[PDB]
Design a protein around this ligand. Sequence first.
Ligand SMILES: Nc1ncnc2c1ncn2[C@@H]1O[C@H](COP(=O)(O)OP(=O)(O)OP(=O)(O)O)[C@@H](O)[C@H]1O
Ligand SMILES: [Mg+2]
Ligand SMILES: [Zn+2]
Ligand SMILES: [Zn+2]
Lengths: 926, 73, 186, 186
Amino acid sequence: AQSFLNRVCGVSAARLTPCGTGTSTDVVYRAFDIYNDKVAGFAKFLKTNCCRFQEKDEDDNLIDSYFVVKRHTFSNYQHEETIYNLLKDCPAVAKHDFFKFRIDGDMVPHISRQRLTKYTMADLVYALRHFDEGNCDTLKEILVTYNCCDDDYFNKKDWYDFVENPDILRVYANLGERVRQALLKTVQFCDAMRNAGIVGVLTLDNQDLNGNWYDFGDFIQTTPGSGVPVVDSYYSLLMPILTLTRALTAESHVDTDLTKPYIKWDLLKYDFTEERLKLFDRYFKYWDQTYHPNCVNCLDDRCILHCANFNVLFSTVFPPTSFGPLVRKIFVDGVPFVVSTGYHFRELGVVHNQDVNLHSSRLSFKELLVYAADPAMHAASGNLLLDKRTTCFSVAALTNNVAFQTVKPGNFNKDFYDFAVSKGFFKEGSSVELKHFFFAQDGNAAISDYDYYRYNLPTMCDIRQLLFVVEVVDKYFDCYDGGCINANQVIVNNLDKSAGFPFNKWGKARLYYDSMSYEDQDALFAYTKRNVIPTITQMNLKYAISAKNRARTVAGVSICSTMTNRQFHQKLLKSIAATRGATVVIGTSKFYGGWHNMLKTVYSDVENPHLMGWDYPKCDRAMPNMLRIMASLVLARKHTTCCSLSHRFYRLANECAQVLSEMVMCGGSLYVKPGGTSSGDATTAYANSVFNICQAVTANVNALLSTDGNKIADKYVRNLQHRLYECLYRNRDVDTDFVNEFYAYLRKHFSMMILSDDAVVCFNSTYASQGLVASIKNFKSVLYYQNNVFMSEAKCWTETDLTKGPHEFCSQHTMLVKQGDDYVYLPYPDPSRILGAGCFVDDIVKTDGTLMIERFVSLAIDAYPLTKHPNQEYADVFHLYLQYIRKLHDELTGHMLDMYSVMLTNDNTSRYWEPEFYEAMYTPHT
Amino acid sequence: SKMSDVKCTSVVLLSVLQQLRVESSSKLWAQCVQLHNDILLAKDTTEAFEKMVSLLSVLLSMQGAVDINKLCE
Amino acid sequence: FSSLPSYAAFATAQEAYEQAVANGDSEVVLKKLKKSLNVAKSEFDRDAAMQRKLEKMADQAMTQMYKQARSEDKRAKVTSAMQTMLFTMLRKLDNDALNNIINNARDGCVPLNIIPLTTAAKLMVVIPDYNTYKNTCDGTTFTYASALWEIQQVVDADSKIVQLSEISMDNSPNLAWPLIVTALRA
Amino acid sequence: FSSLPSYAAFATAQEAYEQAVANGDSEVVLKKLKKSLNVAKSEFDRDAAMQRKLEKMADQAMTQMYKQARSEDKRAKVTSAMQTMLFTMLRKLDNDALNNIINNARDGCVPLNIIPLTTAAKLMVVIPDYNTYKNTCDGTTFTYASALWEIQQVVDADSKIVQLSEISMDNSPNLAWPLIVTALRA
RNA sequence: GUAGCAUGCUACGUCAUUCUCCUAAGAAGCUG
RNA sequence: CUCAGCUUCUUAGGAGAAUGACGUAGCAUGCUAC
Ligand SMILES: Nc1ncnc2c1ncn2[C@@H]1O[C@H](COP(=O)(O)OP(=O)(O)OP(=O)(O)O)[C@@H](O)[C@H]1O
Ligand SMILES: [Mg+2]
Ligand SMILES: [Zn+2]
Ligand SMILES: [Zn+2]
């Protein structure tokens, strides 16, 4: 073996310790992206052909430099020689050494390479894309072998989590430079092999962690002056890492290095189109598709989604004070107003209002509404603010003193607690115990809850994958009828709700829905279809009972935006709510056999079913901007016949300016939302359902493409993945003939039941074990790398038996019971929840049972199913509720008789303390 | 069943404190509210009783507002 | 739904029809009396329906008024009703520490600041009489909240430190009560 | 209706029915006018119903009109109110520096985030603890956003004025963090 | 064949309730 | 102080259906009178 080592390192003076066993191939198990005619996908392949050899420096030790000395046939060897000879000059390439050594009796060509790391960029993207703590040693080695973080940092509890410790981000950023180096050297490679007349496909698995490209077996020579690197399969699998590691962090420094002062961009610079184009031509020069810096010039929703995915990466370079509304000085009646005549979106680029009405004449109700909704004069007349409680940019402080709001403790119903403890409840060792209380918070409640947006990192997403997942997700929404409706066709449940800031100062939403007639509402909706209206959204504090002391703030979005978003999405949302049997079960009641119908729907002919499910850790705040934009797009695909491209883009811009990243008023002070859906917009539940379906489809795609493909014995599935890879990374336009095929495959082997962040799935278990459909590990990985949150074993679950049913959905457990001579699924809630609801109330008057009997009637309606629970105390909960309702009625009758010499007339109320009235709530008749 | 009674007592006591306008003192209100929250999510009984001691002491400090001589009975 | 003038006529018509069927009158007379019945009954039923609707309206108004009155009562006496419940539950718990501190507060021996719980504890108490002082303190130890605290400082009501030996039965009038005792956890 | 002229006709019927029935003679005529009374009643009832319907609609119309009026009035109110707010928040503009920054812009269009950062005459730092206070806001003057901010007043979470000498590492616990320092542009 | 009465039936006006649907309003509960 | 979904209870209005009843028009049959 000495001769082989000498030949390998003959030219290099460096030493060489053989990792292999005497000129024997070393076992290599990496993440080679592959696309052959009989194989496809981006999966961990056991390719054992390289002979890794390491270099030893003085004070013998092994640095991260290896010689990957593999063997090739003579024809491939000659082709590699010719291709390399035309790429020697370029520095973004490995210094190949081609040698001819006899092994036994013939000259097998021993091609070799120099100064190559142990892992490639494919391994880096695979470990960060498919990350399960059960097996993540490759990410450990990558982060420890490049000084990103000390090894001992891996002993921390939840080191990988983006919520338990945000410091993990600081670790990932240490990789960014390397990426941003290998993200630039590739361009050189491209350029070189475009000027050398070489055409081929660039793959991540042919690039080591310092940028060198070390494989030329798949290149053919076109005439010099021509040549096309195909980076669709490279820049798309590497795309989500460029924001996870903040690769373009060395772009805010002069000379673009980490050891120089940040560039001092003039405050007035709002249009960065030129810098965006320079960045695109610098890092993504050979991206085959047209990149529009401003998305107002984009062609279709699949283009507004391509160039917006680059603006989430190029907009992490520009200062955070350049975004938000662009203010211009208009003149009304002579007085100069300052108004938002545009918006510099972090994603949609710079957008200018089509009709900026400077030198106006007079302002009517709609004009005053648009001028008072936007934060132009709110942050133009307001003390500069440096609120250091939040890590989110603070624009201004409207008032002269900060406002601190506390959360009250929640009254206590002594009567019900006495009754329960007199009926044998609330003991030691009982399974049913109080765990739901009205928690209280200090004066930093609202701001501390709003500070949870720090989990909302700026996420760039794999675009070639999202542009297909969006087609499939719309396929899931293909059965609805949606569009734009007039002002007189809008249905609003409560007009007695807040109008948002500053409209909550003068009245409720009723006063702004009735004051301006349908004509003004339609004018305001057609205004948003060609103008961007920024708005302010309070962060109100929610007073609700829970088993955790989270504050649960909710965005009180402004009326000027809620009106228009309703007028835009109402038909589609109502059509989503009013259809039964669909994947989205919003609007489907759990009573009158609805739960059983849903459960049997999820089981729609799944070959080997057994369910799983999930609850996003923090959906509202952790949601990325790209996924929210995609949700707002696929909910606007129903307007193909009513709204043009420009109108739909301006509606997307309005939605982004009013929901996605809008400056909130969290206690008399304007802040800046990093991103993510606000939990007060007109499409919160349905947008969450869209995002959930998108994550599920992405998990399916990653599980079907991350399979080896050689061991798939189902020909149809093998070809399904072989065409899925083509439709993702080779095809460019929507392929309906395969989009519907894959949608059918999912709906067959992967059932779903989506209600916002609640998801129940009835995947075909045998396939999931095989790897042909999304398991729960796949969903965890997808959430990790796309949604930049880690999902632990407290939101997931998996029920191997259908009879028991889903472990939880909407916090209601499921049980199979014999009622009506047929086994039916009944949802029983958590008994502790019901006892807590009874014992603890919001208002002091709710602690007097006689006043609130309907409270207990409704609580018994919700708690009846426990009566059939095997545990005796679970049924005792419902029986106790019935007895307490009877006791309350007796007390009410006695009080009426004593206070007034009149007896309570009519006795229709005898139903409430008899179980018949509550079994009728789960009989499928009505 | 004292474990499930200290939590209700803590809720009642924090309500009583909030009625005494201890909420208009951010530092003391933060102390008492954190004590109450820790009492609620307590799986032990003795620890909840020590936090109950502290909360009741918060109530006792306000001698003027609460007369515990003739209304303790 | 009786006591109305229509029900009397209806009952008389019922009695007349009963007498007719007893006599087995002819079908023509039977029909005539049956229609006299049906008209009297049709009047009484209408009147009784009016009475029933009026009564249901009155009952709903009365119960709404009762709701209003009891809600106003519940809101009015909300402060004292919460303290009574608090002390009832405190007595029910019957813990040693809570009972001890409540008894001390009965005599006025309140704490100046929250009672700490750690070894590095700073507890300040007010001792307004020598009776409570001797009951609670004996030497250089202090009993409070079922806890032992070491007397670190004992300052009079005029901010003057007092040597421990000075406080005696014969020296009690000399000191200006109350005392303030600062102690640590033992 | 009760006063409707058709009532008179009905009355006549009843009057005749109250007269001829008293006589109880002439046979056929008694049977005839009874039907006429049924004719007298029916139409009258019908007319009554019609009138009642009209009355109901009239009431509804009035209510609707009244409702509209209220809305209009409220609309106007808000309009005026909203105008006032704008005017107020228009006058608080530091129009000198605001006009300077607008004119210095390339096309009169500048971000909103830089308006407070460049024309605001008062900074207001909310400091959650003391380490942050000494890091950023220390001294009687400091620098934020390239300006010389003069600390004008420090208040705590209770709105209690805090003298700059009270903010110390040793004395920090006894303060009610956060602190709201309302600096001023020099 | 006309007048009157009786039984039945079809249609319309009138009411009596019961049920269903729904238009709106109020109170409350649960779900993401 | 939010955005949607479902459920219970209460009140008012409208329509329809079921049964009970009155009145009128028409048809079948029966009866008194000429
Ligand atoms: N009261 C609400 N108002 C509006 N939206 C809500 C409300 N509660 C929940 N949501 C919306 O539903 C989604 C999830 O609600 P959920 O109650 O599960 O909170 P969560 O954010 O999932 O918190 P966690 O999972 O950590 O308990 C939220 O993401 C929010 O957008
Ligand atoms: Mg959740
Ligand atoms: Zn485009
Ligand atoms: Zn449309």
